[PDB]
Design a protein around this ligand. Structure first.
Ligand SMILES: CC(C)(COP(=O)(O)OP(=O)(O)OC[C@H]1O[C@@H](n2cnc3c(N)ncnc32)[C@H](O)[C@@H]1OP(=O)(O)O)[C@@H](O)C(=O)NCCC(=O)NCCS
Ligand SMILES: CC(C)(COP(=O)(O)OP(=O)(O)OC[C@H]1O[C@@H](n2cnc3c(N)ncnc32)[C@H](O)[C@@H]1OP(=O)(O)O)[C@@H](O)C(=O)NCCC(=O)NCCS
Ligand SMILES: [Cl-]
Ligand SMILES: [Cl-]
Ligand SMILES: [Cl-]
Ligand SMILES: [Cl-]
Lengths: 504, 504
């Protein structure tokens, strides 16, 4: 049945390839798409091809690409291969785009996800020339129904001089109604409105994105899927991590420091956080509620088992099989899910009010519990800070999760000093690895070190960390946060030099 | 005349030494006190004497000292001299206490100022045995009128098993009415209340701290002043920084990116930020509004002139000259100042909603614009993060201010890598030194470096910085945030070893 239910707009429909021609070299382009969900697919390809052709002719042809968060092969992948992006923000997971960024070929800045809208309205990315937005359907009165995410779409629509919509047969029409778009000033000119959310499951807006139909210069019909990586089935490492955390939650509850149903749950991107949710789907906490940035396979599983009643996020970010699953059971899941603008899902004011429990993965932490979420060896981008800072700093409890080692044991995820810092000590209270859990609340840096080294570090690396700390305590310039600057980053350099942090 | 207007409570009046006997070895003590204002004076002096006497006898006697923020010689000073503090939080500026912390004799954790009350309520500091609070007066119905700051006093009163009040006749009685204390759930158990502040001058509460009279174990009559080091007159360096910043504001206004009256201003503790205020009091912007953690001399000047209409803060941290000037004309300033609980003055939800401009000092930034506010050489505490994180991350614009060098040119305030990080790149958009102003909005790390190096670094260090960056670009593991791990911290080590960052 017709997805474009507004007759007047049908006159604007055209091939993906024609739409792409609206985008000019130098253009700032805002797109839908949040962590592998709901990004535009067909127009990006056409632009990519046109870009390569122009480049061979010696014609400059690159855009600035601002999104909700990560997209997919069809967008980041295609444009990266074409060398078509001079600037990218705020979050990426595509290997080709990542390579461009790590080669200095595409400039990249990973803003806090909840701040992107406000900075765009402030003009930090320049003037938006194009909004390219994927839709489930266009309503009779011209509402744009989003797809598997909301992201920054409403903001990009407001800002852009011209709008291109992609309407996607693949997205299940029962998506219509799952979204909550608030028409208030969240990220506009101060003073901003109060967003009156006081419960994680509370709706305060409507089902559609609003745009002046006059700004719509093109509409493209599509039938393509959100392409995400599957999640790793929880192995012994992941299960141990879940085990420690569930016990921790259990002891908090027994001590009356958490309610039996805990607090609204945020769970970050990646395999480790996902694995913890798989643990929760059969855990001893009932009537859970999610207030997250993304809903991964594990969270969907919790909704499925009924251990979680409802989940708020800006997107569901699912494996191919789970995305197939939810599209086949959209009737069941649509009442369990609320998709919000990312500046609302990731609003520090709301997160703190609700008392969210934040659970996020990490590259590494140093012995003082500073956290790197992003930059391997301090210089090589993995994905980006994403919403981890939005949640870590605002949450009732901030929890970081990681195997105690990486690359088959050749890297320690607990190091003397993080090569890059995304989350300072103040923003991290709990660390969990397969070795144990460190509870850092109320502790000084030296006290944090003792907990982190003794609980979380891998036995292959523990003595070396203890050695570093003991000698730092003796020799450091100051003793408040003891360091030996000649060797603080030496494990990372050892890896670079030899392929392993383990000495020979 | 009579400061204690509740007759019944008069019976609890006693000498300072006697009150101090209520405080026992191991106790967790919460005190009033924020940026050298409104901290208890006589009871801490008495306590310190008794602590030293005990120690002289091989008897242990130490407390955990939790405050609003920094105190003064009578509290931090005396107790540090006595070696009477085993744990301290969240912010200190006393030189003797700083030494205890940096020698490892006092355990320290500098929590974000806006979060301290909530973490106290969560129980991160343990059970509060004692709340010790300075008061201007006690009202007919037993309300406690705070003095020159509010800080965390209401939370501490709520949590503490016993309460001791110091009624200080030095504090002007017309301070009564200047405070705004909310009974709302700001920092308590989730779900918390919406704090409905939508303008900087808005009152939402009442004039007094509330406490069960049955918890009050002692009242001490005092007469002693807040002690706060004077601000030196702005030197040429500080004047240059203010100049660059004011030019920047003027340009934002002419581009319509700020209103002519700017936005609510937050100005951080320290000489540099205060020097900027001094420039604004004689600049082109009128109808200014303060929404800050603290009101320093510069800000008080503008309220005087009528340049600033109102200033919201948790405390006024004035010089002796300024302290007397306001205690004197309290009738006037009384109507231009609102003093709030620090969990409200420093609430990220409100700071964001109001769109504050944050202006803070810093120790150093690296070429990529990560900021160190706290730890010299990464290990030696200066003061603490304070509210700089609260404001930097939540602000409409986050600006950091510093001389381009430190210690007579022997340290570069722009370094290859910051030895410790308090504010990540995402939390800092504008840097200002006497060398110029770097506007980083919308830039990748490599672009940030080009601006910071060229605009902010001192000419004596810029070639060294460019050389580091150039070789990093060629040799770094990744090129997204290029580093040479072999030398990243080598300037700091050079200072440690030779007293200068310049190569010999
Ligand atoms: C940090 C993060 C990459 C961890 O992801 P994860 O899937 O849970 O952890 P994994 O152990 O499976 O590792 C993922 C990759 O990072 C690498 N990695 C993890 N720790 C590493 C370390 N200490 N050193 C080097 N690489 C590391 C792994 O090798 C793996 O790389 P690969 O894909 O090339 O094989 C991921 O959580 C992330 O990008 N976080 C930032 C955004 C965020 O946290 N958002 C929260 C709100 S949605
Ligand atoms: C960072 C901070 C110390 C700077 O203070 P300032 O008065 O503006 O700057 P100054 O240049 O006068 O220097 C202050 C001290 O820091 C030292 N300092 C500053 N930069 C330094 C550097 N790069 N290396 C070593 N020391 C440095 C100075 O030497 C001076 O120390 P001294 O008293 O022993 O001589 C101060 O802003 C602060 O403590 N910030 C943290 C809390 C905060 O910002 N709160 C904001 C909300 S209220
Ligand atoms: Cl809000
Ligand atoms: Cl804590
Ligand atoms: Cl609020
Ligand atoms: Cl930006």
């Amino acid at each position: 049945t017709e997805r474009i239910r507004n007759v007047a707009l049908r006159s604007k429909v055209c091939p993906a390839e024609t739409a792409s021609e609206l985008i000019k070299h130098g253009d700032v382009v805002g797109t839908s798409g949040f962590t592998g969900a709901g990004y535009p697919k067909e127009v990006p390809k056409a632009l990519a091809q046109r870009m390569e052709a122009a480049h061979d002719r010696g014609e400059k042809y690159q855009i600035s690409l601002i999104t909700g968060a990560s997209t997919g092969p069809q967008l980041d992948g295609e444009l990266a291969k074409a060398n078509g992006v001079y600037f990218r923000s705020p979050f990426n997971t595509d290997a080709t785009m990542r390579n461009r960024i790590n080669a200095g070929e595409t400039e990249y800045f990973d803003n806090h996800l909840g701040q992107v809208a406000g900075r765009a309205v402030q003009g930090n990315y320049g003037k938006f020339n194009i909004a390219l937005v994927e839709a489930t359907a266009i309503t009779e009165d011209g509402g744009i129904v989003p797809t598997s995410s909301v992201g920054n779409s409403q903001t990009f629509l407001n800002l852009a001089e011209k709008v291109i919509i992609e309407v996607n047969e693949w997205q299940n029409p029962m998506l219509e109604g799952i979204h909550d778009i608030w028409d208030g000033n969240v990220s506009g000119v101060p003073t901003r409105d109060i967003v009156p959310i006081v419960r994680a499951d509370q709706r305060v807006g409507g089902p559609v994105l609003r745009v002046n139909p006059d700004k719509i210069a093109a509409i493209v019909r599509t039938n393509d899927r959100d392409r995400n990586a599957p999640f790793a089935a929880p192995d012994e490492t992941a299960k141990a991590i879940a085990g420690y955390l569930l016990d921790f939650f259990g002891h908090e509850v027994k001590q009356n420091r958490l309610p039996p149903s805990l607090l609204p749950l945020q769970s970050g991107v990646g395999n480790v956080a996902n694995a913890v949710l798989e643990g929760l789907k059969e855990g001893p906490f009932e009537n859970l509620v999610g207030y997250s940035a993304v809903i991964q396979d594990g969270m969907l599983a919790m909704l499925d088992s009924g251990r979680m009643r409802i989940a708020s996020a800006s997107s569901f970010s699912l494996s191919p099989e789970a995305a197939e699953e939810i599209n086949n059971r959209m009737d069941f899941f649509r009442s369990k899910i609320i998709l919000r603008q990312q500046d609302v899902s990731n609003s520090p004011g709301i997160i703190r009010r609700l008392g969210c429990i934040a659970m996020n993965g990490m590259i590494e932490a140093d012995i003082y519990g500073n956290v790197n979420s992003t930059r391997v060896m301090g210089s090589k981008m993995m994905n980006g800070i994403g919403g981890s800072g939005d949640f870590a700093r605002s949450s009732y409890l901030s929890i970081f999760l990681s195997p105690s080692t990486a690359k088959g044991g050749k890297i320690s995820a607990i190091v003397p000093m993080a090569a890059h810092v995304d989350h300072i000590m103040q923003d991290a209270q709990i660390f969990v690895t397969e070795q144990g859990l460190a509870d850092l609340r109320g502790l000084s840096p030296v006290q944090r070190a003792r907990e982190i080294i003794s609980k979380c570090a891998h036995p292959d690396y523990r003595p070396m960390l203890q050695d570093y700390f003991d000698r730092a305590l003796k020799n450091s310039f100051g003793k408040h946060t003891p360091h030996l600057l000649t060797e603080a980053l030496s494990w990372h350099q050892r890896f670079i030099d030899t392929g392993t942090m383990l000495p020979s």
